[PDB]
Every structure is written in structure tokens, then in C-alpha cells.
RNA sequence: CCCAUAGUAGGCCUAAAAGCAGCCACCAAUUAAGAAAGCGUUCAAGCUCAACACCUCCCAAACAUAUA
């Protein structure tokens, strides 16, 4: 993992799935362990971009998704 | 990593408070007592001074310091070299209000010690709180 | 003196006359020392049995171990071992009198409080080592508060008032309904079928 | 169809058939599943043989009972049958075997949340 | 219900939500069992009732989603176990001895090599004792131990 | 006030500490 | 065998039949009963006083930091007269409807910390937040007007 | 060890009922 | 499920024993984390808890559904 572009629209109707994802694992806590990854968070139906350095592009529109499916699916692509 | 000690500025490199307690991360105590003697020189000498020291994984020293302690600060300001034992009913030093206010003005100042309260009662409540837990009577 | 005082093996004055083992000092509900007296917690006996010296040392030792004397005091309710239990010599033939006095014992009936606790302590603090103690006893015992004691007595009143069963043991035994005093004790008219031998049936109304 | 018996509960795995070849050390306990893989007649056969009165008419009675493990019955026995007896257990139908109107007649009991995954 | 459609793209689509029948005969009941007068009147046989509480890969649904009674959640959970083993739920697979009324998991039960004396006989469990309080239309109750 | 409920919390923490001795 | 024994003595059979006939029967109702139907005002007065105090407000998801890092953020915003407030949204959802904030009811959930202010250093706060590639700016509301993050760029600039 | 069936309880109970009515008719 | 800064490496005794070798007080800061309830170290540093922010070979055969 190299980059995650985490994106949501809180001026519009909120989605706490990707925001909870932003709190628990798109924080410095995992980055205290996982140094190479680079989160960046913008703010204006949400969207999570994942830049694999190797050969993929993992984009998740996590409006109706939940945090556990987004996190375990994310880590399913971390194990790859 | 994080290391926090109470190493006094009276003796720079004693040994067992710095030898084996530092001998895991890998140190050079000559630089530590050299820079620690810079910290001895920059303030009043013959006093306990706590450290901040953060041993980097790139193996460098960053000694950060603030005010003196609360132990030898209050007990020395009350003129007590070896304090009370019970500290529930026994007293040696009777310190007035205004003395505590006069030392409390130069207290809420540091960052590493993080006594960063905006009002005055928020700090004098704390150190009068430490004055009840020691052998000093809060006069007036 | 907020600890359990030492309980001796046998009193200073001996008991020279041998006694018959009147096992009705185990049978039935206890009369002496059922309620609290300046206590808050106890080890209630849910059944009768005999306490030896070794039991008294299990209680004194394993209570005074885990006890805060500045927070908790404790009182013996059961007196010192006073009943002389005899044993004949090992592998000797029957008759020839009654055996010599071997060791002393206290009888404890059911509903007796054994050890009262007191002081600045909650029940949940004292549940632990009084349950360990209550399990090391020879009879079935239980650590009981004041509110838990009145709780389970009010429960027994609820059982005696709620039951949809028209036939109780009291109505059958005292009226001699099915000619059934031929099978019952005369004590079963006052135990009312909650005591069998030395045991106690809490579940039985 | 005595291969297609159905024990209730865990009797396939708990119920034990013990026999003894008369030799020493010849005690043979075998569960109902293993014995049903050996011979698919012996469970119904042992059940009947235990039900019959313990006397000398018992084995003449056992020589009147004809057990077959499948749909296949010999022709000489098919030409003797008179009545087919009703099965004592009503075989509960499964979800595939309910018709559509049977499913539609039963109500949906509870509203699922609009957002729940399954 | 909602599904997680993926291909790399992952989206969530709420698809074809059902609803319960408009007239519970016992409104102001609590469980959907309690609302429909079914407190003791279902078994493992009737799969139209069981199937409504089952994940499409055979597992149970949690008590918060279904809003069941605690009692009826353990009862349905047990009946669904007893109905997978009787082959009454064949389409709740992830992708041969006939049984019914099996309390325990078939691959977990040691055979009874020494059934006891007549006064201490080891019996075989049949059915579940969660289903004691069902309506028995016989005079003898359910024998739970054979 | 603030220190009232802080005091009540500290007594509750003491209580949980005195209960969690045997565990 | 004596009347008191060490094991539970076998009863006579009519004794045992009496004991079984006179068992306890609990009552059964026709319907099962389970199938039938200071600090709080400290937060109300305190945070309600914070409602009338601030002219401008902002908020973030301030859970994504360390202790000394929140000390750095606490000191760098201590450099301003802005205040940061970690408080439950449990009470804040009735706070908003009390303060007539209908556009702010869809704002306050999960981990959040108030940035109540009267003087905007929020551009320089953004200057502190641009060095850390996370912790976004959640929308605020100056004088019953909502600020999007684009509005934080416009007003903060 | 011998255990108490339903026959034995129902028999015992109908004797108890005859007994209770004997108690009634001896009360006047 | 989390979640843990600071007066402080609480004083005295103790080589130092720091919440955790013992005595005593057990106040206090933010919104809130006990001068500390379990690991752990000579001592430390590190791990959890309460509380904050989401909330001799077994032994009847058998059988759960039809109205006592
Ligand atoms: Zn219900």
C-alpha cells in the first residue's frame, strides 16, 4: 500500500462508514506501524481511492457500505 | 524511545541511575552528561531536573527541559532537605498562600511539563493539592 | 481486636464423662444464632455437620490471611469444640465398653451463622474468600449478607404463597392424610419435610 | 427400501449393536451407521426380531419376513402382494417441495431493515 | 436487503426490500413470533417459518435484526440446526443416512458402548428440550430421550 | 459543579478498585 | 443405619411418593409477562453558554492523533483564543434543536471536537492541518450561516 | 433406587382427594 | 469494541525501590484516566482494568405428533 485518497461530502448528507474508516485506520495509529502508506483526506457518494504501488487501483464508493466490509475488504487487498 | 528520569544536576553521570537503565537502547552517556551539564549551567545548580529525552531510531539525543521539580522545589522552598514520613499529620514546613502564588506565577509556563492551564486556580489547586500530600501546612 | 481469635482443640477443663453421639444436634433447623448481631456478612450453614479443630483453623487461617483489619472485623458465632467424639483403638474387637475420647467437635445445624463479618466493606468484596471458606466446610454453606438473607427468606414466603399445588407436606403430615405418619418421623411434623437427616432442601416448599 | 431408513436423533452415531463370536476377545460392538453400511437390512431385521415374542415360533415368523434394501423386489414376490400398508411416519416436505401457493399463503413475519447485508 | 456488487470497483446497492404482512393478528406483541400467535406452535418440520430467519448460506440472523424474543431466538436457532440435518433446507448451501430430530452435531457424539443398568441407563437424546412447551395434542408429552 | 462530579467519579473508581481486588 | 447419616439416606417409597406429590408448582400466567409491554445540566449550561459565546464555530474528527500530538495541537490553538471541546454528541443532538440549528442537525456524530471562536486563526489552523495528510475540516456555522470547507477557504482566506 | 411414575402420583392424589372430602363430612 | 496525558520518578524509609518492597495522605488539571485493581521489571521502561469520545459379553426391542 502506498496511498489512500479518502473523500467524502459532509456539506451533503453524511456517511459515517468512510468517516469511521477515516478515524480508526486512516489515522496515524496504523501509520505508526505502516510507514510507506500515504493517506490524504479531502472534504467538500463518498469515495475511497487506493493506490497500490505494484499493479492495481482500488476504488470504493462507500455510501451504502459499512466500515467492517470496507476495512476487511481493504485488508483483503493488502494481503492480495 | 521514551525515557523520563529525575537525574539531578549535582552529579552528571552517576552510574546506576544512568548505566543499566540506558544500556538497552544503546547510548553514549558522555554526550548525555555533557549536554546535561549545559542544562546544569543554564539554570540554578544543585537541583533535580527531569528530562524529556526521546531516543530516536536514528540514534540521536534530544534533551528537552522545563522548570525544576515539585519535590525539592516545595521542600527546598520550605527549607526541608529530608521530608516528612507520615505526611498525614506530621509537618515541618509552614508555607503561606502568597509564597505559593509567587512560585505559581513562574510555574504554568512549560510545554514538556504541560502545566498549561490558562487560569491560576487551576495550577495552585494542583500544587496546594501536592502541599496537602506532603508535610507543608498551607498558611492563611 | 478485628481478627478471628484462636480456637483451641479442647477446653482447659476436660469432660471426663463420655457422651452418646446424639446426632439430633445436627438434625433440623438451628435455634441458636440464626440472625445477625452487629454483623453485616456471614457464612450461613445450608445443612448440618460437625466442625473439628482443623475446620476452625481453615477458617481462622484462610480468613485472617485475606482480610483488612482496618476495614473489616469478624466474630466467631459457633463456640469452641466441646462435644467429645470417641474412637476405639484401631483394629480391636467389639464390646468391652465405650472407646476413649479422641477429639472434640462442635455441632452446627442448618440456618446457623458461623462467622460474622463487619466494617467498611461491601458484600462483593467479601464474597470471594467466604465462598472459598464456605466450600472448605464439611456441610453445604453459603456466604450471606443481611439483604441476601432477608431476600431468600422473603423468597421462601413467596414459594409458600405462590404454589398452585393443593397438597403440601404440612397438610398431609399433620392431618395424617394417607395414614402417612407410619412412614414419617415425629420430627417431620415440625421439620415439615424440608430436612432429611442432616441435609436441607431449600428448593422444597 | 430398507437402505433408506431414518433414525431419529443421533441414533445413527450413538446406538450400538454388540455381538460376540464365542472366542475369547471376540466381543464386537458396532454402531448403527457402520452396521448399516455392512448390510442394509440388519437394522430393520434386528428391530423386528427384538419385537417378536421370545419363543420358538420366532424364527418361523422371521422366515415370513422379506427385507429388500431398494425399490427392487423380485417378481415372484411382487405377484403375491395384496395390501400396501401406510407408512407410520409422515415425511415432512422440504423447501423445494412446497408449491408457490403454499409459500405465498404463509405470511412474511417480520420487516427486514432496508440496509442489512445478508 | 442490500448487496455488495464488485468487479477494481466495490459499490453497495439496496435491492428488493421485502415487508411483513399488513395485519398481525396480535398487534402489541413483541417478537414477530409473539405478534402472530406462534409462541408454541412451530417445530422443525415447518420450514416456511424457519427460512425467514436464515442467512441464504444457512446461518442464523442475529437477534437485533429479527427483533425476536430471546427464547424464540434460541428456539428457532435450534430448529434451524435440526432442519439442516434432516435435509429440509437444501438450497441454503454455500456453493448418506436419513436423520430427523437430531439435537447434537452428528460428527461429535461418541457411541454408547455401555448402556447402564435399568436404574442408570444412558439414553439417547431425541429432539431439543427448548421445544418442551409446544402444544402437544397427545396425552403423553414428547419423549425427549430414547 | 465540575469538581463535585469529578469527586464522585474518583470515589466510583476507588469503589471499582476495592471490588476488583480478588479478580 | 442411623437417622442421621453421612450420605443421603434412601427414603421409604411412600415417603418418596409424598415428596413427589407435594412438590412446588409455580404459577403460570396465561400470557408470558416478557411478551407484554447534574453532569447532564452541567453540559447543558456549559455548552449552552458556549452557543451564545462563539460568533464562529468549526469542528473536525479529532480522534486521529497521539497524546503529545494533541498537546501540540492544544498549544498551537492555545496561541489563539479559539477553544477545543471534546464532548458527547449524545447530548449535543438535543443541543442543536434547542439552539435552532436545523442545518447543523446533520453534522455532529462520531468523534468530533469543537473549535469555538470569535477571531479566525482558522486559516493558520488549516496551515497547521496541511502538514498532516488527514484530519479534515468538518463544516461550521458562523452567525446562523453554514460554512462548508470551501466556505472555510473563502472566509479563512 | 426406585422412582415415582405418573400412575403413582395420580393414584396418591385421588386418595388424597377422598381423604379431604372425608375431612369435610366429619366437620359438622 | 475502545482507551489512557499531566502535578510526579507522591513524600519517608530504602543503593533506588516511582501506583505497583513497606507506612501514611490519598488532593488535584483539563471534559476526563485510581497517588492505583491484575502482568511486569534490582529499580525503571513497557502490558491489561476502572474512566474519558460511538453506544467372560452391551444388555428387552423400540419410539419425541390421533384427544385419558
Ligand atoms: Zn414473544
Amino acid at each position: 500500500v502506498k496511498q489512500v485518497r479518502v473523500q467524502f461530502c459532509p456539506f451533503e448528507k453524511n456517511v459515517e462508514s468512510t468517516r469511521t474508516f477515516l478515524q480508526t485506520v486512516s489515522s496515524e495509529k496504523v501509520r505508526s506501524t505502516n510507514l510507506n502508506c500515504s493517506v490524504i483526506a479531502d472534504v467538500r457518494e463518498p469515495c475511497v481511492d487506493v493506490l497500490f504501488g505494484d499493479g492495481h487501483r482500488l476504488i470504493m464508493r462507500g455510501a451504502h457500505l459499512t466500515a467492517l466490509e470496507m476495512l476487511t475488504a481493504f485488508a483483503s487487498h493488502i494481503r492480495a | 524511545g521514551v525515557i523520563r528520569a529525575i537525574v539531578r544536576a549535582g552529579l552528571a553521570m552517576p552510574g546506576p541511575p544512568l548505566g543499566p537503565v540506558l544500556g538497552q537502547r544503546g547510548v553514549s552517556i558522555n554526550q548525555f552528561c555533557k549536554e546535561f551539564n549545559e542544562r546544569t549551567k543554564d539554570i540554578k545548580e544543585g537541583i533535580p531536573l527531569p528530562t524529556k529525552i526521546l531516543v530516536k531510531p536514528d540514534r540521536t539525543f534530544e534533551i528537552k527541559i522545563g522548570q525544576p521539580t515539585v519535590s525539592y522545589f516545595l521542600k527546598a522552598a520550605a527549607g526541608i532537605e529530608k521530608g516528612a514520613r507520615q505526611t498525614g499529620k506530621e509537618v515541618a514546613g509552614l508555607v503561606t498562600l502568597k509564597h505559593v502564588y509567587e512560585i505559581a506565577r513562574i510555574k504554568a509556563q512549560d510545554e514538556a511539563f504541560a502545566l498549561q492551564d490558562v487560569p491560576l486556580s487551576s495550577v495552585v489547586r494542583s500544587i496546594i493539592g501536592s502541599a496537602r500530600s506532603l508535610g507543608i501546612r498551607v498558611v492563611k | 481486636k478485628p481478627k478471628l481469635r484462636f480456637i483451641e482443640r479442647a477446653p482447659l477443663v476436660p469432660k471426663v464423662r463420655r457422651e452418646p453421639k446424639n446426632l439430633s444436634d445436627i438434625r433440623g433447623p438451628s435455634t441458636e444464632a440464626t440472625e445477625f448481631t452487629e454483623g453485616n456478612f456471614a457464612i450461613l450453614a445450608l445443612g448440618g455437620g460437625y466442625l473439628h479443630w482443623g475446620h476452625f483453623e481453615m477458617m481462622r487461617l484462610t480468613i485472617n490471611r485475606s482480610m483488612d483489619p482496618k476495614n473489616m472485623f469478624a466474630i466467631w458465632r459457633v463456640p469452641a469444640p466441646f462435644k467429645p467424639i470417641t474412637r476405639k483403638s484401631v483394629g480391636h474387637r467389639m464390646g468391652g465398653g465405650k472407646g476413649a475420647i479422641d477429639h472434640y467437635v462442635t455441632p452446627v445445624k442448618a440456618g446457623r451463622l458461623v462467622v460474622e463479618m463487619g466494617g467498611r466493606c461491601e458484600f462483593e468484596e467479601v464474597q470471594g474468600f467466604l465462598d472459598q471458606v464456605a466450600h472448605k466446610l464439611p456441610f453445604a454453606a453459603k456466604a450471606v449478607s443481611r439483604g441476601t438473607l432477608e431476600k431468600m427468606r422473603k423468597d421462601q414466603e413467596e414459594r409458600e404463597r405462590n404454589n398452585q399445588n393443593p397438597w403440601t407436606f404440612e397438610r398431609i403430615a399433620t392431618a395424617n392424610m394417607l395414614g402417612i405418619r407410619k412412614v414419617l418421623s415425629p420430627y417431620d411434623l415440625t421439620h415439615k419435610g424440608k430436612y432429611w437427616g442432616k441435609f436441607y432442601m431449600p428448593k422444597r416448599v | 427400501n430398507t437402505r433408506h431408513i431414518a433414525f431419529s436423533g443421533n441414533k445413527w452415531e450413538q446406538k450400538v449393536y454388540s455381538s460376540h463370536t464365542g472366542y475369547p476377545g471376540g466381543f464386537r460392538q458396532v454402531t448403527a451407521a457402520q452396521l448399516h453400511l455392512r448390510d442394509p437390512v440388519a437394522i430393520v431385521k434386528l428391530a423386528i426380531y427384538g419385537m417378536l415374542p421370545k419363543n420358538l415360533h420366532r424364527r418361523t415368523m422371521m422366515e415370513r419376513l422379506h427385507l429388500f434394501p431398494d425399490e427392487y423386489i423380485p417378481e415372484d414376490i411382487l405377484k403375491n402382494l395384496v395390501e400396501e400398508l401406510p407408512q407410520p411416519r409422515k415425511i415432512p416436505k422440504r423447501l423445494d417441495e412446497y408449491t408457490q401457493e403454499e409459500i405465498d399463503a404463509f405470511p412474511r413475519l417480520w420487516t427486514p431493515p432496508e440496509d442489512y447485508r445478508l | 436487503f442490500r448487496e455488495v456488487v464488485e468487479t477494481t470497483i466495490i459499490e453497495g446497492r439496496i435491492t428488493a426490500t421485502p415487508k411483513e404482512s399488513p395485519n398481525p393478528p396480535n398487534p402489541s406483541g413483541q417478537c414477530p413470533i409473539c405478534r402472530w400467535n406462534l409462541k408454541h406452535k412451530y417445530n422443525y418440520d415447518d420450514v416456511l417459518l424457519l427460512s425467514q430467519f436464515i442467512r441464504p448460506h444457512g446461518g442464523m440472523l442475529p437477534r437485533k435484526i429479527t427483533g425476536l424474543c430471546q427464547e424464540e431466538h434460541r428456539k428457532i436457532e435450534e430448529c434451524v440446526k435440526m432442519a439442516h440435518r434432516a435435509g429440509l433446507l437444501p438450497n441454503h448451501r454455500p456453493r448418506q443416512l436419513n436423520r430427523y430430530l437430531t439435537r447434537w452435531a452428528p460428527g461429535s457424539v461418541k457411541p454408547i458402548y455401555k448402556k447402564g443398568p435399568r436404574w442408570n441407563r444412558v439414553r439417547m437424546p431425541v429432539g431439543s428440550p427448548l421445544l418442551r412447551d409446544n402444544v402437544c395434542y397427545s396425552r403423553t408429552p414428547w419423549k425427549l430421550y430414547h | 459543579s465540575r469538581e463535585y462530579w469529578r469527586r464522585l467519579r474518583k470515589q466510583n473508581i476507588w469503589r471499582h478498585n476495592r471490588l476488583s481486588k480478588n479478580k | 443405619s442411623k437417622a442421621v447419616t453421612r450420605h443421603r439416606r434412601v427414603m421409604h417409597f411412600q415417603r418418596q411418593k409424598l415428596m413427589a406429590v407435594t412438590e412446588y408448582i409455580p404459577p403460570k400466567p396465561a400470557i408470558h409477562p416478557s411478551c407484554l409491554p447534574g453532569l447532564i445540566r452541567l453540559l447543558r449550561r456549559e455548552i449552552a453558554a458556549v452557543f451564545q459565546d462563539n460568533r464562529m464555530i468549526a469542528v473536525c474528527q479529532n480522534v486521529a492523533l497521539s497524546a503529545e500530538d494533541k498537546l501540540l495541537m492544544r498549544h498551537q490553538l492555545r496561541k489563539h483564543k479559539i477553544l477545543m471541546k471534546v464532548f458527547p454528541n449524545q447530548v449535543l443532538k438535543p443541543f442543536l434543536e434547542d439552539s435552532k440549528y436545523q442545518n447543523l442537525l446533520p453534522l455532529f456524530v462520531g468523534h468530533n471536537m469543537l473549535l469555538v471562536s470569535e477571531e479566525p486563526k482558522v486559516k493558520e489552523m488549516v496551515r497547521i492541518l496541511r502538514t498532516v495528510p488527514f484530519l479534515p475540516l468538518l463544516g461550521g456555522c458562523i452567525d446562523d450561516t453554514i460554512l462548508s470547507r470551501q466556505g472555510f477557504i473563502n472566509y479563512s482566506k | 433406587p426406585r422412582f415415582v411414575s405418573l400412575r403413582a402420583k395420580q393414584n396418591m392424589i385421588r386418595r388424597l382427594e377422598i381423604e379431604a372430602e372425608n375431612h369435610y363430612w366429619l366437620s359438622m
Side-chain angles (χ1 to χ4, degrees), chain B residues 6 10 17 22 30 46 49 52 54 57 65 76 86 88 91 101 130 137:
Chain B
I6 199 70
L22 283 175
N30 49 7
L49 283 167
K52 183 67 171 179
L54 195 275
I65 204 166
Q86 180 182 3
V91 70
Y101 286 106
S130 293
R137 179 66 177 277

Side-chain angles (χ1 to χ4, degrees), chain D:
Chain D
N1 284 322
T2 73
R3 188 171 291 112
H4 303 293
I5 335 165
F7 268 116
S8 70
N10 295 115
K11 294 179 188 173
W12 279 117
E13 294 299 329
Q14 284 189 321
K15 170 177 198 63
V16 165
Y17 293 127
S18 72
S19 72
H20 197 85
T21 67
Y23 300 123
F27 187 53
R28 283 183 191 172
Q29 281 167 333
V30 160
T31 71
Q34 306 178 6
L35 188 138
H36 191 70
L37 297 185
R38 290 192 203 278
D39 197 76
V41 147
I43 284 176
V44 173
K45 190 171 183 178
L46 284 175
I48 295 161
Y49 184 76
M51 298 263 168
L52 291 175
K54 274 77 181 183
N55 59 14
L56 281 188
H57 286 114
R58 185 163 58 169
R59 291 204 190 155
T60 70
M61 280 188 287
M62 289 298 289
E63 284 188 357
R64 259 73 149 179
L65 170 106
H66 305 276
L67 294 160
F68 302 107
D70 297 322
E71 293 285 320
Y72 175 73
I73 307 163
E75 187 57 33
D76 285 337
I77 284 178
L78 284 183
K79 292 185 178 163
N80 291 322
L81 298 177
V82 176
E83 187 189 359
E84 181 175 3
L85 295 175
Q87 296 179 356
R89 173 172 172 276
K90 185 192 172 181
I91 304 168
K93 62 178 46 166
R94 63 175 68 95
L95 263 191
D96 299 356
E97 295 167 348
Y98 287 98
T99 63
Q100 185 52 255
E101 299 87 9
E102 286 170 348
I103 303 172
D104 289 334
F106 191 77
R108 277 83 58 76
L109 287 189
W110 68 293
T111 41
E114 181 165 1
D115 185 77
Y116 185 70
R117 180 182 59 72
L118 283 181

Side-chain angles (χ1 to χ4, degrees), chain A residues 8-15 42-44, chain G residues 106-107 137-139 146 149:
Chain A
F8 62 96
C9 296
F11 177 76
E12 292 173 349
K13 187 174 182 181
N14 311 104
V15 169
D42 55 342
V43 43
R44 295 180 189 175
Chain G
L107 207 281
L137 270 302
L138 180 59
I146 190 165
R149 189 260 182 181

